[PDB]
Design a binder for this molecule. Structure first.
Ligand SMILES: N[C@@H](Cc1ccccc1)C(=O)O
Ligand code: CUA
Ligand code: CUA
Ligand SMILES: [Ca+2]
Ligand SMILES: [Ca+2]
Ligand SMILES: [Cl-]
Ligand SMILES: [Cl-]
Ligand SMILES: [Cl-]
Ligand SMILES: [K+]
Ligand SMILES: [K+]
Ligand code: NA
Lengths: 585, 586
């Protein structure tokens, strides 16, 4: 009834929830403790991390594939895998708008373990997960219409072969499952609580490239996907492929006004943005952005819509409440209220969904409960467990783009303001302003008990299994060996490390040799991480307890070159060093 | 003392944290301990494009090829022994660099690779009469020349050097060859003396060798003597570097004019100047002590009026297991991390001095448990004669069970401690990524930042020069300049529209995009990302930023604004059209 949760997490006390923040155009994922709002860990994903060597090590570059050549990413939408509509703590997925990727993070090790470049698209933006029966598919929007093929003969966005596609990735294999060509474009997406339906907002129904063109239509739409119908067509072989990708491609466009089997287009005003599934599974709610509304699609009416039982796609709209200026996203407390960010008015508005549905029928009922000022210009917002049937109505985070005077000045570039709001009672209460770097757009919270992590690595972990395989071809037992393998101009150093000593403390090579150093940390004490840096060679990486990590570099400078442990690991940490001796050409 | 900063309240101090082996500098508010900004330095930042933009790579020079750094020691420029808020400097141990950050724009504006050395570790600034020199230690002994003919650390031409960088020019000023090696460093309150700890007086490469001697030393530098030798032209140069090199090694037991070696146990680490200017305090690490060098006595030591370099030691208090660093409250107390005992020990410097003369007095005042294994520690304004005795941060290397589990890699634990009273009080546990080693605090009124860029700012003046060569007025022009296989796009940006919304190139063209943000509203930053080309940068109000990339893929390629700038931010986009190679001269 009253909103009175405690926010202080004192020394020695622990946070109640994990928070997983997108890193925005900085490209990483950040783990926070909630309600303290402190950053506990950074998980490199699309960024190159000097500390752990993500982007430099062989294990990381193998996961990134050819996209290892890119040093940037732009991530917005972190989501946790589900079983039976509840978080299962297995995986976190996130998009990369800058280089068109999806990444998977394993929540037991808190590392990115798979990455895919989505084929034949540009800019992976919207991303959310199937909820029921479990996260079989990752659903991802490609935002920008492009020519097909994109070979430089045709540039017109109006061409019959210019379009974008909705993407489904197999969550477990991290291979593409299928793609659906759509009209217009794609902004954000969500899924239902059965597995049959997904939905995405579109703001460029006009297929224009200019600002005024993209705002011409009074209504764009939410495109709804009959995933069962897509799956049936794939199983029957009723698909095409594009370019050199084997991914099954289904055509979800309207042809001469005739609907595809795979899609329905529900008109929604106007350049709508957020696309959020209510926790009771009743509605896809589209945030109206240029229209001061949200539109509520009754998921219960979608089978009739696809069966041809409804005379008009607008018939699945059962509410369209007027809320305020610039609605961008919606979340849920599991008590029947929705909470929507108003970018222009700079507020969070709390409103009762069933009352909004009755107001749409002509009933005189006030569905707006409260408007709370936020600081300033909120984008997305997220209530604890909102993406699950266990939405607990405890905490809300609103992620606001202009912090202005809310923090000390730090130069021309400002932090975002991610504000923690207590929603446990009848009144929302602002309790903490959290400055963050580079515009997290969205975040996701999980109860402490939904996340189970490893304290030390398993020696059979898939994360470094290819390196274990390399060692096997060299006849190396990584748990014990300290040896230097010579192979023409290639040199493969294998060593164990146990604080405060590297297992190989010197080695000699020829100028120009390509050197690979593989280190296995055989300490068993939790938290005794080691590092490895080769001075003046651009080489740096983490080796945590029982991990094997490897890095490759060319020894292009004759002479003595020191290497050292970068992770303070022991009172003799400064002395944990070695020498690479490079004999001149 | 208020410990919690509520919504709408501001922090009272800035904190500048080192980013450790992550390579950036982090700006925190104190006492909230929240991170307000990240300043990329040695890391590549996807968000702002540091390491990708032409302006950043120009500042990095040839070292722009490295994607890593390892920074430990951030320090703020001083005038008359007080922070003046102009510059922050920090080391790079990984690739042997020093970087300068301009505190008005909160960006690294200068970087230097220190010549003929390996691993820049210790770094601190001259205090008096102002920060003319940045002092930096090269940690590892190497051969000179390091050409692969000699590897022996015991060769007469194998050594390391102490380094002085001109703070304003960010060019080398001089280097001093030393015996042993170099760990941490600090400077006095006169400008004459600096000092550095050494742990490898043995010139060894193995753990046992490096621990062999019961004492190493702190080496003291007479900067007046170095300066006088440099003006007299009495120096040599190494390799292709023109930096004056002076010889501070002993030769057959005889001291050089530039250095004195004060025996100190044992593999000492921290080297900290007391805020009253009396002492260089070396933390004994493998010896459970700190050693106090009376800066008073250094002139006499350099004049030969003392029988034993130890005679400048006036205190050696026994404190506990693994002393690593010392800081100061400005009330006559010192605070020392004990890495092994996992504590901060508060002690009275004058009473330790009296105890050294046999007067039995208990100089130890309190020991506070920290969590766990503290390295460096920093009290507010400790590096100045304004040491205010309010806040202390202890930066601990093992956080274990102090935060929620996050997998095998744990955060560090930087703990905020109230030292305003007689009793140290632990108030906040602050988790941090990648091992900040040290940090530095400044009062809010010691830092003055710009809200909008100046159009003549040196950060992008080279880009303005390039534009002028093309006849461009960056404040107004939206033009595509063609120059063979180079294409130079110049545009203004004003939310929510790029001033050039489309341009066409040939496959293989080298494209430079230069964008000047002509919005005047504070906080209205723009971004620029080219999809699937690895291209990303920030353009803040009144900044010009530029980036260069190869249009290696035919077809249409979207670009977009990455910084939420406007209600129509999703629609602030453009298109690069790349004509296929088969349609152009092979
Ligand atoms: N495309 C050519 C290189 C070239 C291009 C244009 C002019 C001249 C040479 C190959 O070889
Ligand atoms: Cu291993 Cu420090
Ligand atoms: Cu410009 Cu968003
Ligand atoms: Ca539209
Ligand atoms: Ca020694
Ligand atoms: Cl959304
Ligand atoms: Cl309620
Ligand atoms: Cl120090
Ligand atoms: K912002
Ligand atoms: K650590
Ligand atoms: Na992959």
């Amino acid at each position: 009834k009253e909103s009175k949760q405690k926010i202080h997490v004192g020394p020695g006390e622990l946070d109640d929830y994990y928070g997983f923040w997108s890193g925005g155009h900085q490209g990483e994922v950040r783990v926070l403790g909630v309600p303290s709002m402190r950053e506990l860990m950074r998980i490199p994903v699309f960024n190159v991390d000097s500390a752990t060597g993500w982007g430099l090590t062989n294990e990381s570059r193998h996961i990134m594939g050819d996209s290892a050549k890119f040093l940037n990413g732009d991530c917005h939408h972190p989501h946790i895998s589900m079983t039976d509509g509840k978080y299962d703590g297995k995986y976190l997925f996130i998009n990369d708008k800058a280089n068109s990727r999806v990444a998977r993070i394993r929540l037991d090790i808190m590392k990115c373990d798979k990455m895919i470049t989505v084929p034949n698209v540009q800019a992976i933006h919207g991303l959310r997960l199937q909820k029921v029966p479990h996260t079989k598919y990752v659903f991802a929007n490609a935002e920008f219409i492009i020519p097909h093929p994109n070979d430089g003969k045709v540039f017109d966005l109006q061409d019959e072969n210019s379009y974008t596609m909705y993407n489904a990735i197999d969550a477990e294999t991290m291979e593409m499952a299928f793609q659906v060509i759509v009209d217009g474009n794609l902004d954000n997406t969500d899924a239902d609580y059965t597995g049959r339906f997904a939905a995405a907002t579109c703001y460029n129904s006009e297929k224009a490239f200019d600002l005024g063109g993209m705002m011409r239509n009074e209504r764009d739409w939410v495109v709804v996907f009959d995933i069962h119908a897509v799956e049936a067509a794939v199983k029957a072989g009723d698909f095409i492929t594009l370019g050199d990708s084997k991914t099954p491609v289904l055509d979800g466009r309207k042809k001469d006004g005739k609907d595809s089997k795979f899609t329905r287009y529900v008109p929604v005003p106007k350049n709508p943005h957020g696309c959020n599934t209510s926790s009771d599974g009743k509605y896809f709610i589209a945030a109206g952005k240029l229209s001061p509304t949200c539109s509520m699609i009754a998921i219960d009416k979608l089978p009739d819509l696809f069966a041809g039982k409804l005379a008009d796609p607008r018939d699945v709209i059962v509410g369209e409440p007027e809320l305020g200026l610039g609605p961008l996203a919606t979340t849920f407390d599991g008590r029947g209220n929705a909470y929507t960010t108003l970018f222009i008015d700079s507020q969070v508005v709390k409103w009762n969904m069933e009352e909004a549905v009755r107001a749409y029928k002509g009933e005189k009922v006030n569905y707006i409960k409260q408007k709370l000022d936020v600081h300033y210009q909120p984008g997305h917002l997220h209530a604890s467990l909102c993406e699950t049937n266990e939405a607990d109505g405890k905490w809300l985070v609103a992620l606001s783009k202009f912090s202005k005077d809310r923090f000390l000045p730090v130069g021309p570039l400002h932090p975002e303001n991610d504000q923690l709001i207590d929603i446990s009672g009848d009144e929302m209460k602002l309790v903490h302003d959290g400055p963050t770097f580079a515009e997290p757009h969205d975040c996701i919270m999980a109860r402490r008990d939904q996340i189970k992590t490893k304290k030390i690595w398993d020696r059979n972990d898939p994360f470094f299994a290819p390196t274990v395989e390399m060692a096997k071809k060299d006849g190396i037992n990584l748990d014990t060996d300290n040896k230097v393998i010579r192979d023409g101009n290639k040199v493969r150093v294998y060593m164990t490390s146990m604080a405060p000593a590297f297992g190989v403390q010197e080695f000699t090579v020829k100028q120009g040799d390509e050197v690979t150093v593989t280190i296995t940390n055989i300490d068993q004490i939790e938290d005794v991480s080691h590092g490895f840096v080769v001075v003046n060679h651009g080489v740096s990486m983490e080796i945590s307890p029982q991990q094997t990590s490897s890095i490759t570099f060319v020894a292009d400078k004759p002479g003595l070159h020191w290497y050292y442990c970068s992770w303070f690991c022991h009172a003799l940490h400064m002395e944990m060093v070695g020498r690479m001796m490079v004999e001149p050409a």
